[PDB]
Curated annotation (Swiss-Prot), chain A:
InterPro entries: Ribosomal_uL11 (IPR000911), Ribosomal_uL11_bac-typ (IPR006519), Ribosomal_uL11_C (IPR020783), Ribosomal_uL11_C_sf (IPR036769), Ribosomal_uL11_CS (IPR020785), Ribosomal_uL11_N (IPR020784), Ribosomal_uL11_N_sf (IPR036796). The modification N6,N6,N6-trimethyllysine is found at K2, K38, K69. SUPFAM superfamilies: Ribosomal L11/L12e N-terminal domain, Ribosomal protein L11, C-terminal domain. It comes from the Bacteria. One of its GO terms (biological process) is translation. Belongs to the universal ribosomal protein uL11 family. GO terms for cellular component: cytosolic large ribosomal subunit. Pfam families: Ribosomal_L11, Ribosomal_L11_N. This is Large ribosomal subunit protein uL11. The protein probably contains twelve methyl groups; at least one lysine residue (Lys-2) is known to be trimethylated. Methylation of the protein is not required for function. Forms part of the ribosomal stalk which helps the ribosome interact with GTP-bound translation factors. The stalk extends beyond the surface of the 70S ribosome and is preferentially stabilized in 70S versus 50S crystals. In the 70S ribosome is in a position where it could interact transiently with the A site tRNA during translation.
UniProtKB/Swiss-Prot annotation, chain C:
InterPro entries: Ribosomal_uL6-like (IPR000702), Ribosomal_uL6-like_a/b-dom_sf (IPR036789), Ribosomal_uL6_a/b-dom (IPR020040), Ribosomal_uL6_bac-type (IPR019906). GO terms for molecular function: rRNA binding; structural constituent of ribosome. Transmembrane segments: none annotated. It comes from Thermus thermophilus (strain ATCC 27634 / DSM 579 / HB8). Keywords: Ribonucleoprotein, Ribosomal protein, RNA-binding, rRNA-binding. This protein binds to the 23S rRNA, and is important in its secondary structure. It is located near the subunit interface in the base of the L7/L12 stalk, and near the tRNA binding site of the peptidyltransferase center. This is Large ribosomal subunit protein uL6.
From Swiss-Prot, chain D:
It comes from the Bacteria. Keywords: Ribonucleoprotein, Ribosomal protein, RNA-binding, rRNA-binding, tRNA-binding. GO terms for biological process: translation. It comes from Thermus thermophilus (strain ATCC 27634 / DSM 579 / HB8). Signal peptide: none annotated. The keyword Ribonucleoprotein applies. One of its GO terms (cellular component) is cytosolic large ribosomal subunit. The lineage of its organism: Bacteria, Thermotogati, Deinococcota, Deinococci, Thermales. Belongs to the universal ribosomal protein uL16 family. The gene is rplP. This is Large ribosomal subunit protein uL16. The keyword Heme does not apply. Coiled coil: none annotated.
Curated annotation (Swiss-Prot), chain E:
Pfam families: Ribosomal_L36. Zn(2+) binds at C11, C14, C27, H32. PANTHER family: 50S RIBOSOMAL PROTEIN L36, CHLOROPLASTIC (PTHR42888), LARGE RIBOSOMAL SUBUNIT PROTEIN BL36C (PTHR42888:SF1). The keyword Thylakoid does not apply. GO terms for cellular component: cytoplasm; ribonucleoprotein complex; ribosome. One of its GO terms (molecular function) is metal ion binding. InterPro entries: Ribosomal_bL36, Ribosomal_bL36_sp. This is Large ribosomal subunit protein bL36. Belongs to the bacterial ribosomal protein bL36 family. It comes from the Bacteria. Keywords: Metal-binding, Ribonucleoprotein, Ribosomal protein, Zinc. It comes from Thermus thermophilus (strain ATCC 27634 / DSM 579 / HB8). Its cofactor is Zn(2+). Part of the 50S ribosomal subunit.
RNA sequence: AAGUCUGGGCUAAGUGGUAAAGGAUGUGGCGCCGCGAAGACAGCCAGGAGGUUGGCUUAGAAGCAGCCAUCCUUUAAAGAG
């Protein structure tokens, strides 16, 4: 018999253990916490990994609801350069890379998100995700 | 680019007394003329901070005899760090040795590591005609690691515009950039 | 910018006599008196007061505001009137009005006897609210600050006498 | 800490601290100088104290140009010994600094950064100081 | 209350008053409270 | 110095790309619930001109240098001026009068309206929607 | 240690713990030795985490100085494990006396009495076996 | 003994009537650039938002321990702070 919610978190893809903060407010839920790894890692066994956010809400008779989003621009590029970790010291240190199209095919994956309906605007932010970790873009 | 400044002639007046009234002693000269002149401090400060010894300060002499001069040297009061007295070279037409600013166009590869671009010369020396005063002159610093040296012998050179100083002259380096990680030794 | 150069209303009906050095400011709630710099010029007009300064020298320019607001303050106080209410947080803590005087029961082996002065009115509505009110503005602000400092707030516990709606920030005990 | 790698004469006469600088009254390497306002003897360890505080402050980055060098031996007598009996023995080095002397010069550093480095450095020092930025006068020199 | 030759501002919330001869520093954070002495 | 040249070369360029603009007092919603009655003000029309949102007496004095009959229905209070003539308005101003009305405490009450080139009133621009 | 006065003072005295449960560890054991004058003291020897042990070590020696009654030489207190040193404590000696009767003041007579003392603040160090009687309720209790 | 002299400034510390690094909304005066009828500065009332934890790091660093680096749609604007 605990009140309703409006929860704001930021949980990863795959690593779904009851370990916090899937708890400190998600117990104010009686949260069906294993419903994540199933409903979420089913549609999102198509991306792979990465922090896909989640807005869960509890109600009167102790149950939840959510519709998650998409994995980082720091993930979809890490697989497309053979990279687990970035580069330790970006801007000068390049490990792997991505082409003008390999950056375009990524905006393709995260377009139902941001704000711009452009492929010219979206991939810039993706191209902005480039230097951010040190991965070079081939001219 | 080129400027204008309002020189007044001066005679036996006591330098220190001009100075007292915010005025700054000087004297303009060349092959032909050499005449005792003074100019206002603040006027000249503004003009000079802007003009330096690269461009052409034109002189509004007190008789419509306007003259095209270059600042050959400013003499500073060593102590309280103010200028004391200028020289004004009057330009003719035979080519004149003087100083043209340098444009280090680009960011080096040395920084883009941590380095420091040490600009040895912020200007160079060249005999050129007063027609062609290339008020900037650029350099390819962009391709520069640390331990990298640039010499005057590179350097584009406009029309045209002869290097006064011997080509082996060094003008640029990128240098190691301190480190607390050093030091402790 | 600027404050002495600012119209003082005289909402009917409120007198504003001028004698040497001091003004007077009369009204329904009462009557006053305000010390003024003899080198400050007072102006009663068509039912609107305003005052003027000889110069722009640091003294006058500052003497302006103070003489303005201090006269203005009197007005707005014989007019409506001034007051602060208070807030006895804390458990055991209580206060009942006794006679014309204010009794506090606040943590000490003796409850404590506050008898008001001329012009101060003590109103204890409920157990945990004290209302001090009157025409002398400063006197109020003052007196209300006696009451509070008969047990100022803690830093570890919402507990003690507080101003009418003044914040609480605390630091942790252990 | 700085001191002549070798010399000719072990000790030397004190002299006198008169005039303004004979040279180096203008910023001539970096973009920002610290300049000297009183005259005094600045001691090998002060220069160092001042250098360090700037390096520690820049932490990685910048260059530091130090334009006084300490080559004047500074002599002292042993404690509790009496007058005469000879000249003291060398105890360190100062450099002689006279108003308008550009002592340090930083480069490749943001104006905000420099003036907080050159400011601290000046606290290390025994004299009064003024921070300045390579004018244009200094290029005309 | 600190007391110093160098009173200064510690953060942006510190104000520098000057009462009764002395230069004080006041601030909602009491630790910063100073008196030049 | 230093506009009259800046943006005043923009305030009557995209406010006079036709003749059917309005004025709404847009501010009092959170930047997410304010990039929702505006970001979706491109789905009641074409292009991307919701409320032009800029300065009164830089619109109400851009309403003289464009001579748009002086948009005098309200230029006191908050000023955003619904560029409804750099879009496709009509009763698409209905697609912007149920939005900022049936959400929060009167989310974006309106001000002015120039009907083709005539002053469309205040009490008469509200139910030009329903 | 970490738990009780803390455990609650942390949670405001609510909350609780029970440890029954005895698993074991493959982790790190590091135990530091505490030395007074280099005369390693056994009783004060303590046992902690490698990071914590590193943290504790300052307190031990430093907490030491109030403890050790003075012996005629500069008196080492140090704390350490297996031959490298986590800590330092030094105890002042100073069994000064000697100059206390010179007044004329040849600089050199003043020195002569300290040339015999400099030999004495050495000789006594090499044969110095040093002790501390109780008060260990104090040093290395904490 | 002889001016409570004559005019123009400063000083409010009994400074003058016993000191330094350093600190300071003390009070003055000249010279020079700034934003201001796109209404500036000060209070207010709104907003201060996204890809995004920026990658490295780490036990947690999500603008905000510390190394690197510093991009775009919304737009009236909003720092990889
Ligand atoms: Mg000047
Ligand atoms: Mg010395
Ligand atoms: Mg000597
Ligand atoms: Mg000597
Ligand atoms: Mg001698
Ligand atoms: Mg100093
Ligand atoms: Mg020379
Ligand atoms: Mg300090
Ligand atoms: Mg404050
Ligand atoms: Mg004696
Ligand atoms: Mg007499
Ligand atoms: Mg008189
Ligand atoms: Mg006068
Ligand atoms: Mg006195
Ligand atoms: Mg005195
Ligand atoms: Mg001052
Ligand atoms: Zn503060």
């Amino acid at each position: 018999k605990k009140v309703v919610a409006v929860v704001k978190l930021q949980l990863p893809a795959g690593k779904a253990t009851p370990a916090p903060p899937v708890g400190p407010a998600l117990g104010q839920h009686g949260a069906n916490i294993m419903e994540f790894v199933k409903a979420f890692n089913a549609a999102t066994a198509n991306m792979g990994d990465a922090i896909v956010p989640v807005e869960i809400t509890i109600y009167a008779d102790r149950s939840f609801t959510f519709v998650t989003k998409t994995p980082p621009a720091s993930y979809l590029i890490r697989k497309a350069a053979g990279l687990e970790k970035g580069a330790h010291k970006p801007g000068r240190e390049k490990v792997g890379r991505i082409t003008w199209e390999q950056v375009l095919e990524i905006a393709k994956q995260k377009m139902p998100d941001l704000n711009t309906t452009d492929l010219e605007a979206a991939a810039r932010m993706i191209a902005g995700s480039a230097r951010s970790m040190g991965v070079e873009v081939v001219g | 680019m080129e400027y204008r400044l309002k020189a007044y002639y001066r005679e036996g007046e006591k330098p220190s007394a001009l100075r007292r009234a915010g005025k700054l002693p000087g004297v303009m000269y060349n092959r032909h003329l050499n005449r005792k002149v003074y100019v206002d401090l603040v006027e000249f400060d503004k003009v000079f901070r802007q003009a330096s010894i690269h461009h052409v300060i034109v002189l509004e002499l007190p008789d419509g005899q306007s003259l095209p001069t270059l600042v050959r040297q400013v003499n500073l009061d060593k102590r309280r760090r103010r200028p004391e007295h200028v020289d004004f070279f009057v330009l003719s037409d035979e080519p004149v040795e003087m100083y043209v600013p340098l444009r280090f166009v680009g960011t080096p590869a040395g920084v883009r590591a941590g380095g420091v671009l040490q600009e040895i010369h912020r200007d160079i020396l060249v005999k050129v005609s007063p027609r062609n005063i290339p008020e900037f002159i650029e350099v390819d610093v962009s391709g520069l690691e640390i331990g990298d040296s640039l010499h005057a012998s590179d350097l584009k050179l406009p029309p045209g515009v002869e290097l006064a100083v011997s080509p082996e002259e060094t003008i640029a380096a990128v240098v190691p950039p301190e480190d607390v990680e050093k030091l402790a030794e | 910018s600027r404050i002495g150069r600012l119209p003082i209303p005289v909402p009917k009906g409120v007198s504003v006599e001028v004698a040497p050095g001091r003004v007077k400011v009369k009204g329904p709630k009462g009557e006053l008196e305000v010390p003024v710099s003899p080198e400050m010029r007072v102006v009663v007009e068509e039912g609107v007061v305003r005052v003027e300064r000889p110069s722009d020298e640091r003294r006058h320019k500052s003497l302006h505001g103070l003489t303005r607001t201090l006269i203005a303050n009197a007005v707005k106080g014989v007019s409506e009137g001034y007051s602060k209410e208070l807030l006895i947080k804390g458990i055991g803590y209580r206060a009942r009005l006794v006679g014309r005087a204010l009794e506090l029961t606040v943590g000490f082996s003796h409850p404590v006897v506050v008898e008001p002065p001329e012009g101060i009115t003590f109103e204890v509505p409920e157990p945990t609210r004290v209302r001090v009110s009157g025409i002398d503005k400063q006197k109020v602000g003052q007196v209300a600050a006696n009451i509070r400092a008969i047990r100022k707030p803690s830093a570890y516990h919402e507990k003690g006498i507080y101003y009418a709606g003044e914040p609480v920030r605390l630091k942790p005990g252990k | 800490m700085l001191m002549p790698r070798r010399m000719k004469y072990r000790k030397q006469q004190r002299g006198r601290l008169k005039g303004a600088t004979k040279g180096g009254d203008y910023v001539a390497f970096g973009d920002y100088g610290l300049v000297a306002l009183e005259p005094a003897w600045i001691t090998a360890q002060q220069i160092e104290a001042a250098r360090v505080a700037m390096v520690r402050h820049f932490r990685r980055g910048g260059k530091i140009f130090i334009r006084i060098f300490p080559d004047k031996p500074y002599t002292k007598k042993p404690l509790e010994v009496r007058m005469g009996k000879g000249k003291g023995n060398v105890e360190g080095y100062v450099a002689v600094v006279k108003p308008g002397r550009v002592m340090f010069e930083v480069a490749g550093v943001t104006e905000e950064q420099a003036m907080e480095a050159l400011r601290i450095a000046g606290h290390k020092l025994p004299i009064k100081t003024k921070i300045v930025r390579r004018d244009a006068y200094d290029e005309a020199q | 209350m600190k007391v110093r030759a160098s009173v200064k501002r510690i953060c942006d919330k510190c104000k520098v008053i000057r009462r009764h001869g002395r230069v004080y520093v006041i601030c909602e954070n009491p630790k910063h409270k100073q008196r030049q002495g | 110095k230093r506009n009259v040249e800046l943006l005043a070369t923009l305030k009557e360029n995209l406010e006079r790309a036709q003749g059917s603009f309005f004025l709404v007092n847009y501010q009092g919603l959170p930047a997410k619930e304010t990039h929702a009655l505006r970001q979706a003000l491109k789905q009641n029309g074409a292009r991307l001109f919701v409320a032009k949102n800029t300065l009164i007496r830089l619109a109400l004095k851009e309403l003289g240098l464009p001579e748009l009959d002086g948009l005098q229905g309200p230029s006191a209070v908050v000023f955003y001026e619904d560029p409804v003539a750099a879009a496709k308005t009509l009763v698409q101003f209905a697609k912007s009068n149920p939005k900022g009305i049936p959400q929060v405490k009167s989310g974006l009450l309106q001000g002015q309206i120039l009907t083709a080139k005539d002053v469309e009133a205040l009490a008469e621009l509200p139910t030009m929607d329903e | 240690y970490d738990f009780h006065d803390r455990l609650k003072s942390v949670s405001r005295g609510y909350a609780s713990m029970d440890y029954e449960q005895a698993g074991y560890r493959p982790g790190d054991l590091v135990k530091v030795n505490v030395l007074v004058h280099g005369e390693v003291v056994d009783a004060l020897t303590f046992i902690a985490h490698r990071e914590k042990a590193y943290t504790m070590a300052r307190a031990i020696v430093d907490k030491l100085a109030e403890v050790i009654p003075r012996q005629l030489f500069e008196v080492p207190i140090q704390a350490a494990i297996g031959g490298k040193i986590i800590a330092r404590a030094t105890v002042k000696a100073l069994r000064k006396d000697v100059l206390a009767k010179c007044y004329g003041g040849d600089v050199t007579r003043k020195k002569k009495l300290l040339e015999k003392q400099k030999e004495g603040k050495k000789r006594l160090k090499a044969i110095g076996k040093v002790e501390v009687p109780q008060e260990a309720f104090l040093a290395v209790l904490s």
